[PDB]
Amino acid sequence: KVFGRCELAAAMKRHGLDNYRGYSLGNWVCAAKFESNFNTQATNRNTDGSTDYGILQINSRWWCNDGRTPGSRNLCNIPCSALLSSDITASVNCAKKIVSDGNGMNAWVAWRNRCKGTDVQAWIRGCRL
Ligand SMILES: [Cl-]
Ligand SMILES: [Cl-]
Ligand SMILES: [Cl-]
Ligand SMILES: [Cl-]
Ligand SMILES: [Cl-]
Ligand SMILES: [Cl-]
Ligand code: NA
């Protein structure tokens, strides 16, 4: 599913991301925009052989099992495929784990490089929330 901007903001809000670990909702929408273009089906291979999955591009090296990343962990206790669902519940729950790990939203390279320090409230402007 390819979400609209405000549709995703609402979904994220309902699943408790707004101000989760101090990150306002715009931060999460902005990260989703630049990680996946709001597409739950997005996948990208990494050089190490791990793959990033879903609207928040969650990596199989640590967070999900895809059966092809040897030596990796599955800290979210989910198949990576669960992260590609039109229902973002699994992605949001696993994102909460990641952002709690110590490095905050710096875990998301696109967040750090294109959202951090910017006017992220823009991403939820005009939305009914
Ligand atoms: Cl929308
Ligand atoms: Cl947009
Ligand atoms: Cl915001
Ligand atoms: Cl699994
Ligand atoms: Cl959803
Ligand atoms: Cl933080
Ligand atoms: Na894994």
Swiss-Prot record:
Gene Ontology BP terms: cell wall macromolecule catabolic process; defense response to bacterium; defense response to Gram-negative bacterium; defense response to Gram-positive bacterium; killing of cells of another organism
Location, primary (coarse class): secreted
Compartment annotation: Secreted
Residue ranges of domain C-type lysozyme in the record: 1-129
Active site: 35, 52
Amino-acid positions noted as binding substrate in the UniProt annotation, renumbered to this chain: 101
Disulphide-bonded residues: 6-127, 30-115, 64-80, 76-94
The keyword Repeat is assigned to this record: no
One Pfam family per UniProt: Lys
Extra facts: Lysozyme C is capable of both hydrolysis and transglycosylation; it also shows a slight esterase activity. It acts rapidly on both peptide-substituted and unsubstituted peptidoglycan, and slowly on chitin oligosaccharides.
General function of this protein: Lysozymes have primarily a bacteriolytic function; those in tissues and body fluids are associated with the monocyte-macrophage system and enhance the activity of immunoagents. Has bacteriolytic activity against M.luteus.
Similarity-based family: Belongs to the glycosyl hydrolase 22 family.
Protein name as annotated: Lysozyme C
Species of the source: Gallus gallus
